Amino acid sequence: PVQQIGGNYVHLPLSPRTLNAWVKLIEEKKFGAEVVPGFQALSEGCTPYDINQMLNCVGDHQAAMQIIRDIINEEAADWDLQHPQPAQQGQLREPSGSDIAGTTSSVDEQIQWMYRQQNPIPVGNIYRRWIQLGLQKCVRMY
């Protein structure tokens, strides 16, 4: 997530312990249900970068990544259209679907987007609850 240093916002990364307590939620509960909110709780206030950091920690128990990516693109699609860029220079770009998901953006951008004065956009808590929707998918598969 992010910490404010004198009116300025700086990425504070996820403490190791804060990933552990999460990797453990799977391997000890292995999806199911207790993870949908479990994740949501850890997910609180993160950037797209952070969310990603979490997932890579469990690309071994990976039989579920494929369907989550499915919804991300499904919604990224819904996004690259409804709110398009639609275009520049100097000013930071408008966040596409690949941006919001953290795959074509830096964390600086993601913060630059979450906390801009003129029209701030919560990429964290947007992409965040794509992950939420893609997870119920997983859940039912049980």
Author numbering: 1 to 87, 89 to 143
What do the paper's sentences say?
To provide a relevant structural context for evaluating the mutagenesis results, we determined the structure of the SIVmac239 CA N-terminal domain. In particular, the five α-helices of the SIVmac239 N-terminal domain core did not deviate from those of HIV-1 or HIV-2, consistent with the observation that the SIV-HIVinterior chimera remained largely resistant to restriction. We compared the SIVmac239 CA N-terminal domain structure to all of the previously reported wild type HIV-1 and HIV-2 CA N-terminal domain structures in which the surface features were properly folded. Specifically, the 4–5 loops and β-hairpins formed two clusters; one composed of HIV-1 structures, and the other composed of SIVmac239 and HIV-2 structures. Measurements between the HIV-1 Cα of Gly94 or Gln95 and the corresponding Gly91 and Gln92 of SIVmac239 indicate that these two groups are separated by 3.3–11 Å in the structural alignment. Similarly, measurements between the Cα of HIV-1 Gly8 and the homologous SIVmac239/HIV-2 Gly7 show the two groups are separated by 4–8.5 Å in the structural alignment. The SIVmac239 4–5 loop, like that of HIV-2, is positioned further over the conserved surface patch than that of most HIV-1 loops. Structurally, the surface patch was conserved across SIVmac239, HIV-1 and HIV-2. The C-terminus or the 4–5 loop, helix 5 and helix 6 were in very close agreement with the structures of HIV-1 and HIV-2, indicative of strong selection to preserve the overall architecture and amino acid composition of this site.
TRIM5α is an intrinsic immunity protein that blocks retrovirus infection through a specific interaction with the viral capsid. In the case of lentiviruses, the cone-shaped capsid is composed of 12 pentamers and approximately 200 hexamers, each in turn comprised of identical copies of monomeric capsid (CA) protein. The N-terminal domain makes up the outer surface of the capsid and mediates interactions with cellular cofactors. All reported retroviral N-terminal domain structures contain a conserved five α-helix core, from which a conserved surface feature, the β-hairpin, protrudes into the cytoplasm.
